[model samples]
Target: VSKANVPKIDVSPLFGDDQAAKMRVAQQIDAASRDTGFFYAVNHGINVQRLSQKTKEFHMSITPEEKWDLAIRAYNKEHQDQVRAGYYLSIPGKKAVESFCYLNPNFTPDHPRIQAKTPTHEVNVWPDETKHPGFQDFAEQYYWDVFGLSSALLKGYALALGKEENFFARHFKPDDTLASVVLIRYPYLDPYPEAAIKTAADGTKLSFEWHEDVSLITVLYQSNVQNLQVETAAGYQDIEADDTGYLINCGSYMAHLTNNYYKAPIHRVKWVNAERQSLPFFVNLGYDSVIDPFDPREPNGKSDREPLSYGDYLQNGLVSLINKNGQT
Candidate 1:
């Protein structure tokens, strides 16, 4: 029955298959990345029920009035400045947008707050554990599942780039850094803001203008919605919901890894008649991973370009964030 719900992609064969499987999967990835920068991946090993439940939990906890309340609070804050320490979460009267609810445990050592010496980017707010059953387990499990899935796909990318597998392992090990999941709810709009919001005719969108998530990779599970679109040579294409899997895409780092030969896709959450929800696993590389350009000794044309540390790329991104005029 669920199979009838949407389109499906079975990429399982791409891993152990022969040349044809590799070619098919490679073409699909290239097409999807170039067109929409998004695709649904099934058998991605993430629990659909858990993802659904957390989405519902976030949806139920925040009321419409509360969303507006939180929006005002969020919009008022200084989103340009990057605050890794804890104080970032405590902007007075600022309620976090539900999109940012889940935090990667790999980044936080203890249950600490900003004033208590935690960093803003490191603060993970947990709902009352008792009230929201299974929240903690579900969150942690989901994080690792995507983590592994992304790593596998990254190797696939290496193959696509004509390089050896394990090429990027050193920089992408678990516990190296933080990647966040944004389980956000974007309800219908009555009179959406015209200028502030650009995705909708009335200026309403399923989600706000999210930053081009700069990470190693980004994998997402669509909630049977049609608003998710990615930019490609053929123009923006809708990544229709799939019954078999979540949609995966490459990001800036991989684009860099390919020496800019490959591109970092751009995706947008468009508005629709009904409210929609999605789970985006922003796959991140390790903290100390150096992202130098490909070495000449290694295969491919990686050696032709200059290599920069992953830390440097992240730093430049932060600088852009600081100078960026957008709000959270």
Candidate 2:
């Protein structure tokens, strides 16, 4: 079988003293990271059913009035060069697929991301608890749950590289981490299948352009509808959501941290005939922390690239992207 495709690995064994089992998973991660930079984590111990249901509930319940209200608040803050916590809608040209960004609700007030006044972490605008009930609570809970899972996978990666399990864990401290989540939705298209390429328009046939995430690691949750496609050594291949596990991938930050041992793959979404929703939890280090190679002996160890603080690196990207595609 071709190893270029993303492999499915059972990671439940990482929680115990089964060194053999742990190594098995770690080795799988190492290979996948080096090859495709993506993998499907099975037996990850997360409640996918619960997560999907809650995600559906919120997206389904969001009314046009509520969406309009959220956008107005966010746009109002743009006048002051600030970003309000809320939903940001992006619909360019005449695309059938529309998407939005939901700001992180679990912001650490004293954290540098907030203290520095980064637009991304300014404030989370959420529906009222009385009206939305447990919406906010569920979003916060889901973020942390996936955050914890990402931390464990990072440990596995560390051990895979012959380093201590806590090697990467120590860098992800509570004081300055920049973890955030975005609940993305793709409603069903009325005109049927979307084009694979765009010739007359500037935007591509994809709802999401082909791009790599800038965070250290990205944990993604997919609904029943599947239209996600990932680039492989062979070519681009469509991927479906695994009911029991989350899709995990390394990103630019991790590539830099690992001395380019792992790369951030290019991926995009093509809307199918049905509605689709996904939650991507972007995990990152503290704003003040600099991303440098963890081990000098690792591959690409002699990187000449200068160390850049997470805050600066991220702000530059965020500002540039938001300017082009509005974000709340």
Candidate 3:
């Protein structure tokens, strides 16, 4: 019996020759999308073993001096020269270390978007070889492997809405996509900071406070840790999860795209006290992609809500989140 309501789907059907299985998988994903807004996608093509090995090397194998230069920090008054995640986020929850992985691997400095200095199109910051050898190579490899998998899911997402299988391909170009990756590490907080040690709940100490992602969808591969919970009618339920099948969830963009047809789930992470790592790829439409509900999928085969450009929708949610954080 599954403890959580989230579905575990084998998504290889989307890539195979069987249209019947493909359609079935599409509807299954649609159900999870519109219902729980979360599911486990198995048989997703990327091999994660190397990614896992490199992650451990990143967190535990490296010494303190090797880490500071690679640790991700906010572009605030202190570090005005740093890349503006705002422009997204730099929230380093208490006792957490993280790094930003932008579209560096795919978009060279000569790329038009990079030249234009588009949002999230900035060249990435990597650890100096003297500080952390082979890290840049591993992180970049993981970036595109996840990138392709996220793009492939679009075919299934479109089929779920009864649109052409390649419906979303037009919006996601090989180099122009805005989807990005983030690596987060929850190192052992010996006493745990008072700020993150909020009380009043049963067996719950929050490292990541409750919130919803602003991405169209989030594909997360986390270390085997029982620290995540999702809101449900019964209560906040524990997720029966593993990285063999990465977890997927809806977010603000998809919520707006479907006019609430697909929910953006409110989820939070519990303090594990032990070391943990999370690799999450935030899948979003390209800068110019329009966010509108599919006509045939809506009740009237049309939407009353007007759709706007992807950039507009992204900034709308991002600014709201940024304004409330402490640094602001």
All candidates: TM-score: 0.72, 0.84, 0.87
Q: RMSD to native for every prediction?
A: 6.4, 3.8, 3.5
Off by over 4 Å in 1: 1-9, 13-37, 62-97, 110-123, 189-196, 199-211, 233-235, 295-304, 318-325
TM-score of 1: 0.72
Clashes of each: 24, 2, 1
TM-score preference between candidates 1 and 2, better one: 2
Model 2: CA > 4 A from native: 1-4, 72-84, 90-120, 192-204, 294-300, 320-328
Query: What is the C-alpha lDDT profile of model 1 across 30-82, one tens digit per residue?
Result: 55555445555666565787677676775666444333333323333543322
Candidate 3 backbone collisions, by pair: 85-88
> Looking at candidate 2, what is the lDDT of residue 266?
75
Candidate 2 lDDT by residue in tens digits, 1-328: 1223668988887777888888888999988887767788888778888877887787777776676566634444443433434565534334443334444454657655677776445555677677688988887777677877887888888788877787777777655566767777666655544342232132335555666787878888777665667777666666766656678887777777666767788777654556777777777776677756664465644576678787676777666655643342
| Residue 297 displacement (Å), model 2 | 7.1
Per-residue alpha-carbon lDDT of candidate 3 for residues 119-147, written as tens digits (9 for 90 to 100): 65556656566666887888878777887
After TM-score superposition, what is the CA distance of residue 249 in candidate 3 from its true location, in Å? Answer: 0.8
Off-target runs (Cα >4 Å) in candidate 3 are 61-81, 84-94, 199-203, 295-299, 324-328
